Copies of this chain bind each other. A is one copy, B any other.
Amino acid sequence: MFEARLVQGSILKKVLEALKDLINEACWDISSSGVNLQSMDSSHVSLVQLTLRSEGFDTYRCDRNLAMGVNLTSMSKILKCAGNEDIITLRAEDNADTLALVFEAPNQEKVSDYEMKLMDLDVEQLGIPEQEYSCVVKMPSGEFARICRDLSHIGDAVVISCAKDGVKFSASGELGNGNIKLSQTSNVDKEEEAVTIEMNEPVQLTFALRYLNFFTKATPLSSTVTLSMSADVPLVVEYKIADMGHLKYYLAPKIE
């Protein structure tokens, strides 16, 4: 059966808090090679895709494929009961329609057991057309969160622009317009703190800001975020979950 031991359940909790408000319910596709979760929000504008490889877990055992359509809100409500440093064991019996979340303690006298009731979800795996992006900005996740949360105060549409000497996020609204421009750092004191712009052609796109703000709730997962995009192709916000996988949000451009 599905028996996975995660040493630090903070990763799982942060993942659930990153997916909680974008998508209500998702189909965790468990396999012998890892865990996947590909689903698009209720408005069909953005598509979140999570992958957690097997080697990131301590003892990941899966003999048969599973599709556990968990309710993400309830799953996060259960995950909240776990501690910050707890070892989390996910156990899905061969076929039981319940997922056992076992929150052990950091080698202490507390063990918590929860049996989250699954629900049957009509699995659908839409094809993600592999594509080559013209601009790849790599920036500290704090800066992107700040930029989106700031320009959200002005307008609801961010115009992202990739030149060669720096990327600029513009926005406009009733109270004026404002544009934040970042230049690529040359003396990277910390490889985290750098802003690296792999540019192959200057691009300019427009995106909604509700969805970028929904994306930036995954900032505790990784320090660096990768904004990869090209013309007439949904932007790709990528957060690398350290040595165990990634969390990748796709967002379709805005009309006009």
Contact = CB atoms under 8 A, between A and B. Distances in A.
A109 to B, nearest CB: 4
B78 A113 contact: no
Nearest to A181: B111
Interface residues of A, number: 40
A98 B174 CA distance: 12
By DSSP majority rule, is chain A's interface helix, strand, loop, or mixed? mixed
A106 to B, nearest CB: 12
A113 B109 CA distance: 49
A110 B142 CA distance: 13
Contact of A178 (B114, B184, B185): B114
19 contacts: A71-B175, A74-B175, A77-B153, A77-B154, A81-B150, A81-B151, A81-B153, A81-B154, A108-B188, A109-B185, A109-B195, A110-B143, A110-B180, A111-B181, A112-B180, A113-B181, A116-B176, A117-B175, A117-B176
